[PDB]
């Protein structure tokens, strides 16, 4: 089953992502194949999958940037029918915007079937061109046709996945308590995490006893990622992953505040020092408190 | 004994505070009597008292605004000697900048005696004028002379005072844990707290599911007070009081994030809702976690 999340949806046949052209919020904005760069924010190519309760394996697909929904034009079962961005809502009954997503015959890629037409999201002719038409097209759940097969490359973690990542870390103090703020988190590439840090002005901040010390840097960095989240994305129903941790050294005589993020595989945490922008597998403190 | 803290130092005879003229960081900036407004930030009139270890009841007095020290000019024991702002350090051995502060004969006001000259901070002639000379002057620990008597009006709380304030509150959840970030906190009048909130742009922010919801507003408000702290004050060795709390309703089925501050008497907390700028004795949640 596809879990609730943010996915980069990549064609199984050619290296083309599902892309809402120019990220435009206009109704009828064409959704097309476009090339992508790994370990970046592919700004027009992220999709919030929202499960519809009481309809098995069916979702809305919301462009994280535009806040508009993958829409099969007039819900036509005709092959070649336009797939566009269109205004809607996460739990809409509009079947132009409802998508049954289940594993392809290869067991790793998915097919995307319009709930109303029962036709499939097709990268027309397997065209690897930037701006290649994606359409609703006749097909079957079992065939190998790669025009209609899509890797759902997962870009978010549930809170529960975040917890699992922290609990797998060997620098957690015996007294650790974690405070969970949200349910679903876009995981940032370090390159993006670092850019948000630079854009916060924190690289310019100086350490000052109590008035601007490690707790002030850690919380400024979490607030800056929360600000960036609301200012960058028009979709709702997710947060941006950026943790705060208070830690203690081995001697038990020094406390420090810092940030953490997750690895590309989402399986482990990495510590971030907001006073120099370093990433570390070991920051020299054992976390006794985190919030994220 | 005077505790480590930030004090508004007010003459016992007339309503004049010790004021570093124009808050100037220039060496030899005159320190004078000036009128004040209660329940405001008196920007040039706050003094960080730092106890010197191994010298009983003796302190540096650092202007919170200027980051410069109360300085008896050339340490002269002559009556009429200038008291100025001067560059120095919190644990200086320069006795021009060391002050023995102990209760006056009335048991409530203090006398301020230069550790080197043994002469007293005197509001010359009890002059209530704005800009009235303050000087080192001959005197005795026991006399009633109000020119030389000073109420130390305490503006900070220790972390321990903050804890006592929270523990006195009746909206603390059974599972509550408090995470202490600093040691000494300037307590803001609501009028100032509110201004920092308005100046953060938070009144303009909209509630968005997970992407900018109550946790995002609470942490943006704490970061904005930390920013205001470093940008407003040149002294070090204190923080600005602004709490974050996560709470749960009576039903146990809803969690909310909010801020809190302290009362003017420092004895109790007040909840702040950063989504509407309201202050409340009861926000409808019992705090299970705070950091401050
Ligand atoms: C059958 C038809 O469904 C709705 O119209 C859809 C479009 O729906 C969506 O956009 C419209 C505004 O253009 C509206 O906001 C609606 O709530 C939203 O779901 C859309 O799917 C287009 C393109 O495929 O096709 C239909 O026109 C509805 O608005 C109509 O009244 C009517 O019931
Ligand atoms: C290369 C080509 O692959 C298959 O055709 C696809 C199309 O496939 C889909 O539509 C056809 C009807 O045109 C049929 O219903 C099939 O079951 C279904 O997967 C479609 O992907 C289009 C648009 O991109 O491209 C190809 O024409 C196959 O049917 C052809 O014989 C041939 O092997
Ligand atoms: C006896 C004298 O003490 C020091 O001088 C003080 C002044 O001291 C302070 O400012 C100077 C720079 O002007 C310097 O930064 C020093 O570290 C700091 O404590 C000051 O108290 C003035 C006014 O009362 O009087 C003396 O000039 C020291 O610098 C001198 O070398 C000398 O030891
Ligand atoms: C009104 C006045 O009060 C007292 O005099 C103060 C001064 O008092 C202090 O200095 C005098 C020496 O001039 C003396 O040493 C005294 O013990 C000490 O408190 C002083 O505060 C000045 C500057 O403001 O103003 C007054 O002159 C008292 O001695 C006077 O007789 C008279 O009652
Ligand atoms: C916001 C904008 O993002 C990039 O341009 C997008 C583009 O993005 C993808 O394609 C480019 C090459 O054209 C790279 O592979 C990126 O890794 C992809 O994310 C597409 O989304 C198209 C179609 O919507 O629109 C462009 O705006 C970037 O090149 C721009 O500089 C800018 O950052
Ligand atoms: C920063 C500056 O603060 C105020 O002016 C100060 C002034 O402050 C005190 O006196 C005024 C009346 O003159 C009020 O009672 C205030 O409550 C006091 O804090 C003094 O500190 C003098 C001497 O240093 O300098 C002025 O700058 C305020 O009036 C200004 O508008 C401004 O906010
Ligand atoms: Ca939340
Ligand atoms: Ca701090
Ligand atoms: Ca601290
Ligand atoms: Ca949130
Ligand atoms: Na469902
Ligand atoms: Na001492």
Author numbering:
A (entry chain AAA), B (entry chain AAA): 2 to 293
Task: Quote the authors verbatim.
The Marasmius oreades agglutinin (MOA) is the holotype of an emerging family of fungal chimerolectins and an active Ca2+/Mn2+-dependent protease, which exhibits a unique papain-like fold with special active site features. While acting as a dimerization domain, the papain-like domain of MOA retains the characteristic L-/R-domain partition of PLCPs. As additional feature, the MOA dimer carries two binuclear metal-binding clusters, symmetrically placed at the dimerization interface (Grahn et al., 2009). MOA requires the presence of calcium or manganese (II) to switch from the inactive form to an active protease (Cordara et al., 2011, Wohlschlager et al., 2011).
While other divalent cations cannot functionally replace calcium or manganese, cadmium or zinc inhibit the enzymatic activity of MOA (Cordara et al., 2011). Zinc and cadmium strongly inhibit the proteolytic activity of MOA and papain (Cordara et al., 2011, Shukor et al., 2006). It has been suggested that zinc binds at the catalytic center of PLCPs, directly coordinating the cysteine and histidine side chains of the catalytic dyad. To provide a structural basis for the inhibition, we collected anomalous diffraction data on MOA crystals grown in the presence of either zinc or cadmium. The anomalous difference maps of cadmium-containing crystals (calculated from data collected at 6.0 keV) show a similar feature, consistent with the previously suggested inhibition mechanism. Furthermore, zinc and cadmium inhibit the activity of MOA by forming a tight complex with the catalytic cysteine (Cys215) and histidine (His257), as predicted for papain. Finally, we showed in this work that complex formation of the catalytic dyad with metal ions like zinc or cadmium inactivates the enzyme.
